[PDB]
Structure 1
């Protein structure tokens, strides 16, 4: 007789205590909505990071009677039973919006059981475990600790149904354990990628999306030295009451590589902070864009022959994954767009930015002299307009006396003196660049310039930023930061200033980059093999979606060359827009950002847990609803 309505939720992940990847940001942004639903029935569980946990967690005395409510007692008693057997942990408040409750286990305090637990797991599930793989060691240590902790809560809490939700294989070991030991909790597993997915796509030669149905998983996992890891992912997918992925595209991948068709998808939400005035973001775009204009003026000093009032900023940003993030298509397409723009005789310019970290030796001398010379021009101009102001003023205050017959000066000579001209001329000379020197394709000195994938592609297609190129190309091999001496914007600030994000992903389980972009109200190009793109694709009819600034390139059903051409089409369609059209588009794409808020995507998590309880206690569940609903899906339940 367990309460399905008043239930507990434990959410388990490697990244709870600490930031490794994006998952840390998912559980962080997801917290406010979760705590709103559960309050003190919710606990996140992860391994303790001894180095950092004190910056992020608010340590709490869990022994205190007041630390838990009457109905939460079992959790306290469960921790005491863990403490009883020498298992050290930290219970506290994760210092983030929502302030969820945390249980972090000290894996050193349980490392003793390593030999036995490894032996056990091998016997139960068939999972081998090489000693030099520190991560699966920790994955295992965690798994037995969590199933242990869960088993004990199940013992002492007769009131609530318990939901246990695990993220990624590194947090999946408890799953086969809960199944086999038949612990009275319902379980959910979310995968945010698949191990074989990443690896089969690493080299860039393999035709992933048309061939994965015919891969021998065991053979491949052995080929990559990944067999043990893969076993953990598979056992977690098979053991869980509910199996989920972050996206339809990974769900496809998952069915074939983990041999189980997901029960649904849990797409990543963001915690969107609205402005008091809807148009505020529109003002921010203009401020931020002026900062970029500034950067551009300096970068093109001595070669500035285009109109910024008619210049669009494209960007790609993210980790340096040349094939997987589609940097190759981005550059390829830009080169073809350059051609189309010249043939049509348009006066517009695209300045294309690539923001991807590469080994480098900091900014070039050129980058910094240029900024400084432009600054020096600004300051001189300012001195001069003070002078001009003094002369305009005298004239205006003097009229019509002492010969002044016109109210205003009519001769520039009256306002602009020769000493003024000399210093302006000197500043202009400072900006001149030597004959034949084009603005660089890069802001940094690179460690391995000759072998760099991105730079080689730019050089191969020959986008050298010459006067007649309508598409300019700037590689910035480092993450943006308002401390950057040449382009002093934080990443988010930069995105707001740009016009179009271009993210032609080939392997991308989610798509934080275009989502985040969408949230800043900036249109973007994605692909249908990106999680975000595939999500969007299901939500809006593909022609409609261009109007909300989502452009989706088909990389799944189209030859690579046909994909590049579609990308050029989109970019070209965008450049043809007028300012009015751009503005109104950004408005539409700003309204779309609602659909990426947790207030909406959190409903999916609700669907998943509702499915888990439905599956685990079907008798009691029907008894709540009124009749028997379908349980072969998350969707077929609601």
Structure 2
């Protein structure tokens, strides 16, 4: 008589209360939706990061009786036990929108059992692995502790049934344990990308999405050193009642690479209202200001008729598809010359690299302009007073002014056949850096014949940038079109947040986001909603490139009013992406677990027998 209705949740991964990857976000943005559903019956569990944890967590004393209700008493007692046996953990709220309650397991306080545990594991599978793996040891210590905690909860609790959700292989040890100990909880496992999948497109090259049906079973994990780890991931995936990934495209790798068609898909929501005067028109002007002092001396074109394009995020040169972008771009320049077009594109690249801060050449620009601005402004409020005064008494440029204007202009001259740079920084390894190398090869040097300009800002943007004075969320609202033509991207929060900000974006059907979006919008109405999905799965690499160039040309060749109606449709799409809607997909998977584990209790609750073979099936 375990309760299915009023039941409990335990979500685990290594990124609870400490940033390590993107999962820290997903779990975090998800918080307030999931906390509203469950209030005090939801608990994030994860390994304690003794450094960051104190800034992240409101530390609480679980020992007081007020620390849990009479209904939830069991967890208190599970913890009592859990300290009794010399395991130590931090209990408290996570200091994030939602205040979700958290359990943080001091993995040092159990490194004692390490040997017996690292042991019990391959002896529940195959052969062990070098001590040269600080990662899996922690993965394991964590899993065993968590398993242990769930046992005790299931031991002491009998009111509620317990759903234990697990994110990514590192927190997936607990899973084999729970099957092989047959403990009274139901488990869900979400992979945010396959482990095999990361390695295969690492350097190179296998028509990944093409020749992976046809890939060496184990040997491939073997050759990469990933073998013991693949096995945990594989072990994790198969042990859980429910197996999930974040995007349709990631469930294609999941199926063939870990051998289980995921019972569903948990695509990542955002809290939209954390994003939503004209913002676009205003941030654009702050960009404009940097473009002015960047192209100083040789400013041949109309910023009134200039479009901003950007790619941004961790510097994965080929996965992030920065290769295709710089490429599609040179081609776009070509087309634009021929059609003798009057438009100009400045394309930005906001991917962080090894640097020595800003080129002197660049700081002079955003100095001399800030300078010209002041003078122009001083000279004009002077004109103001002289004019107004004349007017008010009835019945322009002084010499002093000309002298200073003429200086500000000289100050701005371009050092003789010197061209607007393609970086804004001093590059630690300039002659090798992948991005500059590509830009060099396709020969975009911001020549005034070029209609496409290239600027590469090898740093995440921060608002008090002396050169580009914007928060990245400001820089985005500011641009016109985001270009994220990815190869490997299990979700890709960039295109998502870009869209949520009401900016049109180009994505790809091999992007977690792109896949989800394709499978959402009716194919054709995509382009007009301001999402361009570029096929990078079924087309020749060169075919795709030409398709990105098509979409680009289409965007340039658009009336101000067209651009606007598009933008508007992308604002309208923002509502599809809020947790409130993506969050139902988590409820679908848990309810799967709650069924598959307690089928007769289920058939008794719903009053009838529903299909369990897959997530949506049951609803």
**Same structural fold, with TM-score higher than 0.5 when normalized by the shorter chain:** yes
CA shift, 1:217, in A, is 3.0
- Aligned counterparts of 2:317 and 2:548: Cα–Cα separation in 1: 17
Q: 1:275, CA displacement in angstroms?
A: 7.5
- The residue number in structure 2 matching 1:489 is 470
- The answer to whether the 8 A contact 2:254-2:260 is kept is yes
Q: Is the aligned partner of 1:364 residue 2:367? A: no
Deviations 1:474-499 (A, max 9, x none): 00111111121100111111011001
Q: 1:52 to 1:471 in 2, by over 3 A?
A: same
- The alignment partner of 1:43 has SS state of strand
Shift >3 Å, 4+ stretches: none
Asked if residue 205 in structure 1 is aligned to residue 200 in structure 2, the reply is no
CA distance in 2, matches of 1:259, 1:335: 42
Q: Is the contact between residue 288 and residue 496 of structure 1 (CA under 8 Å) also seen in structure 2?
A: yes
Q: Is the 8 A contact 2:275 2:500 kept in 1?
A: no
Q: Is the 8 A contact 2:461 2:471 kept in 1?
A: yes
How far is 1:432 from its partner?
A: 1.1
1:320 CA displacement: 1.1
Displacement after TM superposition at 1:363 (Å) = 0.4
What is the Cα deviation at residue 583 of structure 1? 1.7
Task: Tell me the distance in 1 between the aligned counterparts of 2:25 and 2:412.
Answer: 44
> Retained in 2: the 8 A contact 1:301–1:433?
yes
Q: Give the TM-score, by structure 1 length.
A: 0.96
State the Cα distance separating 1:129 from its structure 2 match. 3.1
Give the greater-gyration-radius structure (CA).
1
2:497 maps to 516
Give, in angstroms, the shift of residue 247 of structure 1: 0.5
Task: Check whether the contact 1:125–1:176 (CA below 8 A) recurs between aligned residues.
Answer: no
Does the 8 Å contact 2:110/2:141 carry over to 1?
yes
Question: 2:113 maps to which residue?
Answer: 113
Equivalences for 1:227-306 in 2 at 5 Å? 227-273=227-273, 283-306=278-301
1:126 and 1:628 mapped to 2: Cα distance?
40
2 CA distance for matches of 1:433 and 1:593?
44
Query: 1:551–1:570: 8 Å Cα contact kept in structure 2?
Result: yes
Deviation at 1:205, TM superposition (A): 2.5
Q: Is the Cα–Cα contact under 8 Å of residues 88 and 109 in structure 2 kept in the other structure?
A: yes
For the 8 Å contact 2:308–2:347, the answer to whether it is kept is yes
Superposed CA deviations along residues 272-303 of structure 1, whole A, max 9, x for unmatched, are 11688xxxxx7111111110000000000011
Alignment: residue pair count: 618
Q: CA deviation at 1:59?
A: 0.9
SS of residue matched to 1:431: coil
Larger deviation, residues 355-364 vs 127-136: 127-136
Q: Which runs of 5+ in 1 are unaligned?
A: 277-281, 400-414
Deviation at 1:206, TM superposition (A): 2.2
State how 1:8-23 maps to structure 2 within 5 Å: 8-23=8-23
| Cα distance in 2 between the residues matched to 1:136 and 1:96 | 28
- Deviations, residues 124-171 of structure 1 (Å, cap 9, x unaligned): 133623211001000000011001000010011111110000000000
Which consecutive residues of structure 2, in runs of 5 or more, have no partner in the other structure?
none
Aligned partner of residue 611 in structure 2, secondary structure: coil
Tell me by how many angstroms 1:395 deviates: 2.6
Residues 274 and 25 (structure 1), Cα distance of their counterparts in 2 relative to 1, 3 Å cut:
closer
Whole-angstrom CA distance in 2 between matches of 1:236 and 1:68: 31
Residue 345 of structure 2 is matched in structure 1 by: 350
Separation of aligned partners in 2, 1:593 and 1:337: 29
RMSD value over aligned CA atoms?
1.1
Residue 60 of structure 1: CA displacement?
0.9
How far apart, in 1, do the equivalents of 2:346 and 2:523 lie?
27
Distance across 2 between alignment mates of 1:398 and 1:110: 88
Name the CA distance, whole Å, in 2 between partners of 1:275 and 1:48: 30
Mapped to 1, the partners of 2:530 and 2:344 lie a distance apart of 20
| 8 Å contact from structure 2 (residues 319, 487) kept in 1 | yes
